[PDB]
Amino acid sequence: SAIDVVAEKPSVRLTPTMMLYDGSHLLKSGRYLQQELPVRIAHRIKGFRSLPFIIGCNPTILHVHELYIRAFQKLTDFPPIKDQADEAQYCQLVRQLLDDHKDVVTLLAEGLRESRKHIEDEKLVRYFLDKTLTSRLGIRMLATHHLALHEDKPDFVGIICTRLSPKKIIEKWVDFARRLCEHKYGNAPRVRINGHVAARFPFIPMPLDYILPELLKNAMRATMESHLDTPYNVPDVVITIANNDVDLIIRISDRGGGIAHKDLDRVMDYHFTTAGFGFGLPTSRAYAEYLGGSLQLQSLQGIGTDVYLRLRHID
Amino acid sequence: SAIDVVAEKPSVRLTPTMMLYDGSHLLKSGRYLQQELPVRIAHRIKGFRSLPFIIGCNPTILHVHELYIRAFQKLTDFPPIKDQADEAQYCQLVRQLLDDHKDVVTLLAEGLRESRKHIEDEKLVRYFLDKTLTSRLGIRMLATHHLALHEDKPDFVGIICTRLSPKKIIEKWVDFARRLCEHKYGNAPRVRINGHVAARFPFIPMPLDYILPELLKNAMRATMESHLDTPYNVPDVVITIANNDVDLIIRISDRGGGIAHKDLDRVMDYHFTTAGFGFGLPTSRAYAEYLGGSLQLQSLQGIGTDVYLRLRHID
Numbered sequence: 001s002a003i004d005v006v007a008e009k010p011s012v013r014l015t016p017t018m019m020l021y022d023g024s025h026l027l028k029s030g031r032y033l034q035q036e037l038p039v040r041i042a043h044r045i046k047g048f049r050s051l052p053f054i055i056g057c058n059p060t061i062l063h064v065h066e067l068y069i070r071a072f073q074k075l076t077d078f079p080p081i082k083d084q085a086d087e088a089q090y091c092q093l094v095r096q097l098l099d100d101h102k103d104v105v106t107l108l109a110e111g112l113r114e115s116r117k118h119i120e121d122e123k124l125v126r127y128f129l130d131k132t133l134t135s136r137l138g139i140r141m142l143a144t145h146h147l148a149l150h151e152d153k154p155d156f157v158g159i160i161c162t163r164l165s166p167k168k169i170i171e172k173w174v175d176f177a178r179r180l181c182e183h184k185y186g187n188a189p190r191v192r193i194n195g196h197v198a199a200r201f202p203f204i205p206m207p208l209d210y211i212l213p214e215l216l217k218n219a220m221r222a223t224m225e226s227h228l229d230t231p232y233n234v235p236d237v238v239i240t241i242a243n244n245d246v247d248l249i250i251r252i253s254d255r256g257g258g259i260a261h262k263d264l265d266r267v268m269d270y271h272f273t274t275a276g277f278g279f280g281l282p283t284s285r286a287y288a289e290y291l292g293g294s295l296q297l298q299s300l301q302g303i304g305t306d307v308y309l310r311l312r313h314i315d
Numbered sequence: 316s317a318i319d320v321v322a323e324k325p326s327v328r329l330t331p332t333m334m335l336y337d338g339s340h341l342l343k344s345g346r347y348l349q350q351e352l353p354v355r356i357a358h359r360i361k362g363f364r365s366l367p368f369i370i371g372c373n374p375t376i377l378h379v380h381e382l383y384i385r386a387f388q389k390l391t392d393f394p395p396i397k398d399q400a401d402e403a404q405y406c407q408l409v410r411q412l413l414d415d416h417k418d419v420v421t422l423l424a425e426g427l428r429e430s431r432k433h434i435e436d437e438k439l440v441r442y443f444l445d446k447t448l449t450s451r452l453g454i455r456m457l458a459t460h461h462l463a464l465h466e467d468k469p470d471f472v473g474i475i476c477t478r479l480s481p482k483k484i485i486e487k488w489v490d491f492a493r494r495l496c497e498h499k500y501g502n503a504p505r506v507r508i509n510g511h512v513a514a515r516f517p518f519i520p521m522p523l524d525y526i527l528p529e530l531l532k533n534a535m536r537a538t539m540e541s542h543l544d545t546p547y548n549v550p551d552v553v554i555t556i557a558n559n560d561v562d563l564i565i566r567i568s569d570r571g572g573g574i575a576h577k578d579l580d581r582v583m584d585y586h587f588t589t590a591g592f593g594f595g596l597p598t599s600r601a602y603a604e605y606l607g608g609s610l611q612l613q614s615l616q617g618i619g620t621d622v623y624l625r626l627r628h629i630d
């Protein structure tokens with residue numbers, strides 16, 4: 001019954017600009033998390049109680065539901081943070097929860113894959129995954145930021161990098177994606193980065209750390225699958241960075257044949273794949289829209305695809 | 316898995332005009348029911364599988380869900396009707412199902428009453444009850460009509476009365492409602508019937524048999540509750556019948572104080588009551604709209620309420 005009571009509370013949202021602005025600040029941050037996390041968690045548990053019956057009964061969905069109830073119990077059992085010793089122990093609980101739930105997206109994807117087909121309105125699944133995954137991103141950002149306030153890392157204020165270079169973060173994920181792709185196909189497309197390659201601004205890397213490898217793996221696979229006769233010489237994937245006062249734009253352009261007309265209306269659905277998870281595109285778009293940006297696709301059937309990632313700047 | 320297969324089939328709808336138009340017709344009717352009933356039932360079972368998890372888990376909701384699966388099993392186990400002896404036994408199954416499920420509305424109302432409060436979007440409950448109760452009405456009409464084709468009742472073709480008198484059916488339910496009301500309050504309002512009191516036309520009485528006592532019990536209770544100082548002399552409930560080529564209109568006008576402005580936006584919700592079931596108004600409106608008509612309310616706060624029941628004629 002505690003879930004219904006806590007879910008009726010508002011929810012004080014923290015904007016990345018508020019996050020940017022002795023150890024007294026650690027106690028105020030700890031107390032904010034103590035009051036905020038159970039409220040966000042209770043809304044998500046209410047979302048699990050509302051899922052279509054045949055889906056809620058799935059053993060994997062039930063397991064994630066139990067994990068989330070257990071997380072609510074541990075957080076609500078923690079006594080109010082009064083001093084530094086209390087805040088240090090609360091950090092341990094936050095680390096444990098971050099670790100215990102690192103594979104939640106995989107569990108949700110597999111628990112929903114077959115059960116999803118036995119319901120009358122599949123759009124409930126899109127709403128549920130969008131709400132759950134974006135709240136999970138927001139929760140993981142608040143939790144990781146609080147922990148990182150205990151570090152003395154240059155160019156960082158918690159998880160906010162004060163001098164983020166989009167070129168360097170893109171390069172980090174290009175090297176990761178090229179290695180996965182070379183392991184499966186024997187080669188990977190070269191990536192050229194152009195535009196505002198020297199841009200540097202305050203930014204939270206965490207959402208880029210999910211979106212970028214997802215969009216890079218897609219562009220590289222499409223390129224390899226459409227050039228099977230010449231895997232040793234495939235067209236480059238071209239990334240353009242456009243930086244302005246309102247937003248950061250990253251366009252990832254490939255020559256991997258495009259997204260077919262018959263598939264275009266389904267690529268943004270969870271579980272849809274032409275391979276195998278089918279989560280990269282709908283999750284990337286939900287994450288981007290949650291942070292005030294967008295993910296837009298331009299398909300040139302027979303040639304390739306342009307993917308546009310737009311993320312807002314920190315005021 | 317048989318439910319998902321049968322739910323993908325279309326559904327041949329029977330219009331009351333088709334119903335109006337040796338015993339060969341009994342075998343054709345039996346075979347129609349044999350193919351039609353499991354299709355309608357499979358869609359309703361899919362609706363139960365899609366209900367919010369906390370509702371689907373309710374013991375009473377689970378019981379109705381089990382009853383409906385068992386009904387699907389018995390109907391799908393029945394071998395194809397080839398002769399008169401097969402059709403006679405199928406009639407026994409239809410009587411048993413009509414009897415086993417006579418209290419379904421009560422079970423659904425009580426299984427949904429508390430569980431309803433623990434979900435994020437209560438409008439799913441309105442859609443579910445509207446879809447389930449109207450399909451149940453349609454199924455009970457098809458089943459009762461087939462059985463009544465075995466009777467030789469004057470002025471009837473199955474459940475279709477060829478010379479239905481709205482005044483006589485209104486009077487039948489006025490006597491029933493006045494008795495319930497006199498038992499609780501010591502008196503009941505007199506009912507005057509005016510308008511097309513001599514009208515006679517082909518019509519199916521069954522939906523009037525649900526709607527009329529529901530609207531009569533409401534008008535009588537409102538009248539008694541707003542005249543507690545003079546229960547021996549309360550204003551009459553006035554019913555007007557308007558018959559034309561397109562529809563039959565029955566207006567039930569009372570002087571029971573009206574429906575308050577603060578309640579008006581909730582009276583059409585299932586479970587809403589100022590007493591105690593809270594199903595009479597939303598069920599009556601779902602039934603009327605299902606048959607091509609409507610139920611409209613006009614409230615005169617401080618004076619009384621006019622309820623307008625409109626039902627289409629049989630072409």
Ligand SMILES: Nc1ncnc2c1ncn2[C@@H]1O[C@H](COP(=O)(O)OP(=O)(O)O)[C@@H](O)[C@H]1O
Nearest residue numbers: 218219222258267273274276277278279280281
């Ligand atoms: N750059 C791209 N070029 C061509 N097709 C693409 C591209 N990105 C995505 N797609 C198509 O969209 C589908 C869904 O992508 P995604 O959600 O990442 O799932 P997955 O990668 O598991 O298939 C892919 O299977 C593929 O058919």
Ligand SMILES: Nc1ncnc2c1ncn2[C@@H]1O[C@H](COP(=O)(O)OP(=O)(O)O)[C@@H](O)[C@H]1O
Nearest residue numbers: 533534537573582588589591592593594595596
């Ligand atoms: N004729 C009427 N006059 C005044 N109030 C009415 C009338 N009919 C219905 N109501 C109001 O609408 C509510 C809902 O009616 P209904 O769905 O029949 O449920 P119940 O009869 O169980 O209360 C009633 O409790 C009452 O407040």
Ligand SMILES: COc1c(F)c(F)cc(-c2c(C(=O)O)sc3cc(F)ccc23)c1F
Nearest residue numbers: 041044068071094097098101104136139143
């Ligand atoms: C989708 O919303 C929920 C939720 F309902 C929940 F019960 C737990 C978590 C959650 C983590 C995660 O699912 O990955 S990590 C983490 C770190 C914390 F300190 C507190 C909570 C969490 C969450 F996101």
Ligand SMILES: COc1c(F)c(F)cc(-c2c(C(=O)O)sc3cc(F)ccc23)c1F
Nearest residue numbers: 356359383386409412413416419451454458
């Ligand atoms: C809401 O739709 C359903 C349903 F899913 C179901 F399983 C059974 C019935 C049902 C009756 C009832 O619920 O009252 S009576 C009856 C007589 C029959 F011959 C065949 C079926 C029924 C029904 F309506």
Ligand SMILES: [K+]
Nearest residue numbers: 267269272278
């Ligand atoms: K997809």
Ligand SMILES: [K+]
Nearest residue numbers: 582584587593
């Ligand atoms: K009501």
Ligand SMILES: [Mg+2]
Nearest residue numbers: 214218280281
């Ligand atoms: Mg992908």
Ligand SMILES: [Mg+2]
Nearest residue numbers: 529533595596
């Ligand atoms: Mg009533």
